[PDB]
Design a protein around this ligand. Structure first.
Ligand SMILES: [Au+]
Ligand SMILES: [Au+]
Ligand SMILES: [Au+]
Ligand SMILES: [Au+]
Ligand SMILES: [Au+]
Ligand SMILES: [Au+]
Ligand SMILES: [Au+]
Ligand SMILES: [Au+]
Ligand SMILES: [Au+]
Length: 676
């Protein structure tokens, strides 16, 4: 029950020691205890934890990467935060600050004047230069020389000014102290404010630290990696990298990550911020930043689905990966590199493989275990693209993937030029029971297509979540028919299926499906959740079944959100959510390529090819809905609707977000950690 903490100095070792003693006093026998292993450096502590000689050490971002690499394979487990519990700020954001008075993008930096905090600083040098590496002219070695040849002039504090003079065209001499006015965070900023340089590579917070008034800050903007600009306020959507400030790492396997938390949590309570002046966890009597940044205001537990590559982020790992590997391509900078599609079944992999060979090597294939695994691969660049249902388009979005192409199902002449935006989830109720409004559904009897279905379960219950009486979903409706629920619950009490099929999600239920939940509506039921065209396709004599023959539209109204009621064909204005189509998701940086390659690919192997036995076609599966839903006719370009929030209804988002409170996703919880 003891955690072996690793110190990298003598001063640190001492702090660890009194950290042991002070935690020895307050904590009872059945409490965590601290041990103090002492090594020579951060690298040694890393190898020690790997060799199972120590348990935990707290690293900067650069070392977090080093730690995860073979043969160490360490992972982040506990993080320092630097604000309050509502504003944690466990991360910082390397930004590129510019005048609003200028007009140029990230990809137009070549030939501009730059301002760096200092050579070797992550935010002010490593990150930017790492991202810009391939855009620098050959030779890239040495780096200082290359960066000199990229910017017309620079202030790079702590550069070989005598060898690379241009790196100090803005601050002559390359002063690496506060005597150079263009040095550090405040200095790199003043380098911009004074109009000496065109761009300042700094932290998101730098601008707030140097300009108090929102008036002056508005004279500045941010360079986003997609070659757009945004106000200084929205760094969260316009940064060069998101960097974990200080992180605790342990073994990826057998790390005792729970003990570290159990310890560190009970430490920050007894000796956290403004706690005991007997011993400060975030203050050193013997130096500064011993074991932990004195900045820190506490700890947070890192969700367990988090690997190091996920925690640092694509951009961060790319920056340092370039600096180390230094391997740029040589292929025409115009032509799209192949798109790595992610498969999650054997049959998915097979179909993908065939696609790849006919794609003349323009499509590639990557296997992953689950959907959540495939999404992770997209995130960190192991894969490029995949098609997701609304539920996953949401999770991918929370992780910062973007919808680019919608699966079109309706035969449209120019469907390539029009997204669908899906059908409409409606709550239908007869005009008979006439005092029914959205509000007084509490304790009413209901009729769902099936539990886990979008229009039938997800959307309605998702929105009813605010008043759902806890994750107990059977408590809301006195009784109902939710095919798939446990065969003993209140939501199986209306399902008229004889024998084994009494509450089973299949045809033999009779009160299952869109058409079924509607029979459930009439045959013992108050309310039913279906699609917008379920009423018109079952009434008017469209359905010749015993119960359905003689039903008419005029009888059934649709329930609205605002509490009002409306006719059926007024669904457009009286709907719950806009149950969406499946959509191809990808990284923002590969948005351009996915669009083209997939447009060309659906031309060759699209819905427009017959003789699918002698020629490959993309929208036919061997089994069922491999890679894409087989109902797809084309892939619609998502102009405008190319964020998760903008592709899914604001209501769909609210609903799915609510349901995800009862059914956790380890990926989602990890992604929401980086983006709260
Ligand atoms: Au103490
Ligand atoms: Au550190
Ligand atoms: Au900030
Ligand atoms: Au205490
Ligand atoms: Au502080
Ligand atoms: Au609860
Ligand atoms: Au495009
Ligand atoms: Au086409
Ligand atoms: Au576009």
């Amino acid at each position: 029950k003891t955690v072996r903490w690793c110190a990298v100095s003598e001063h640190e070792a001492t702090k660890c020691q009194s950290f042991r003693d002070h935690m020895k006093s307050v904590i009872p026998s059945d409490g965590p205890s601290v041990a103090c292993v002492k090594k020579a450096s951060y690298l040694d502590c890393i190898r020690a934890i790997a060799a199972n000689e120590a348990d935990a050490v707290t690293l900067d971002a650069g070392l977090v990467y080093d730690a995860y690499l073979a043969p160490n394979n360490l992972k982040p487990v506990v993080a320092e935060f630097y604000g309050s519990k509502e504003d944690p700020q466990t991360f910082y954001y390397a930004v590129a600050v510019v005048k609003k008075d200028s007009g140029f993008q990230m990809n137009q930096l070549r030939g501009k004047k730059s301002c760096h905090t200092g050579l070797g600083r992550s935010a002010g040098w490593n990150i930017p230069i790492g991202l810009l590496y391939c855009d620098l002219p050959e030779p890239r070695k040495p780096l200082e020389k290359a960066v000199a040849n990229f910017f017309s002039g620079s202030c790079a504090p702590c550069a070989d000014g005598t060898d690379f003079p241009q790196l100090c065209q803005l601050c002559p001499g390359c002063g690496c102290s506060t005597l150079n006015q263009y040095f550090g965070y405040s200095g790199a900023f003043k380098c911009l404010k004074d109009g000496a340089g065109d761009v300042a590579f700094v932290k998101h917070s730098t601008i707030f630290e140097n300009l108090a008034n929102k008036a002056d800050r508005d004279q500045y903007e941010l360079l986003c990696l997609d070659n757009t600009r945004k106000p200084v306020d929205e760094y969260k959507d316009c940064h060069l990298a998101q960097v974990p400030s200080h992180t605790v790492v342990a073994r990826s396997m057998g790390g005792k990550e729970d003990l570290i938390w159990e310890l560190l949590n009970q430490a920050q309570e007894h000796f956290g911020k403004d706690k005991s002046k007997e011993f400060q966890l975030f203050s050193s009597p013997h130096g500064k930043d011993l074991l932990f940044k004195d900045s820190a205001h506490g700890f947070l537990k890192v969700p367990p689905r988090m690997d190091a590559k996920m925690y640092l982020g694509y951009e961060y790992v790319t920056a340092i990966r370039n600096l180390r590997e230094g391997t740029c391509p040589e292929a025409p900078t115009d032509e799209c590199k192949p798109v790595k599609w992610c498969a999650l079944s054997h049959h998915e992999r097979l179909k993908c493989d065939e696609w790849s060979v006919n794609s003349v090597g323009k499509i590639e294939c990557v296997s992953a275990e689950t959907t959540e695994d495939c999404i992770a691969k997209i995130m960190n660049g192991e894969a490029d693209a995949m098609s997701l249902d609304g539920g996953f388009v949401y999770i991918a979005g929370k992780c910062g993937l973007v919808p680019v192409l919608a699966e079109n199902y309706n035969k449209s002449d120019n469907c390539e030029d029009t997204p669908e935006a899906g059908y409409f989830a409606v709550a239908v109720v007869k005009k008979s029971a006439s005092d029914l409004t959205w509000d007084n559904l509490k304790g009413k009897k209901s009729c769902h297509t099936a539990v886990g279905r979008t229009a039938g379960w997800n959307i309605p219950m998702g929105l009813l979540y605010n008043k759902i009486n806890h994750c107990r979903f059977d408590e809301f409706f006195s009784e109902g028919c939710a095919p798939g629920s446990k065969k003993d619950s209140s939501l199986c009490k209306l399902c008229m299926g004889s024998g084994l099929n009494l509450c089973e999600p299949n045809n033999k239920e009779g009160y299952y499906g869109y058409t079924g939940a509607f029979r459930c509506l009439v045959e013992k039921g108050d309310v039913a959740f279906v699609k917008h065209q379920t009423v018109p396709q079952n009434t008017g004599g469209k359905n010749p079944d015993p119960w359905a023959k003689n039903l008419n539209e005029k009888d059934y109204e649709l329930l609205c959100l605002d509490g009002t009621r409306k006719p059926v064909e007024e669904y457009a204005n009286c709907h719950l959510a806009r149950a969406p189509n499946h959509a191809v998701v990808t990284r923002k940086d590969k948005e351009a390529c996915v669009h083209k390659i997939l447009r060309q690919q659906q031309h060759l192997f699209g819905s427009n090819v017959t003789d699918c036995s002698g020629n490959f076609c993309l929208f036919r599966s061997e089994t069922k809905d491999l890679l894409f839903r087989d109902d797809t006719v084309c892939l619609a370009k998502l102009h405008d609707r190319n964020t998760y929030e903008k592709y899914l209804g604001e209501e769909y988002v609210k609903a799915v977000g609510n349901l995800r409170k009862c059914s956790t996703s380890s990926l989602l919880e990890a992604c929401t950690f980086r983006r709260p």
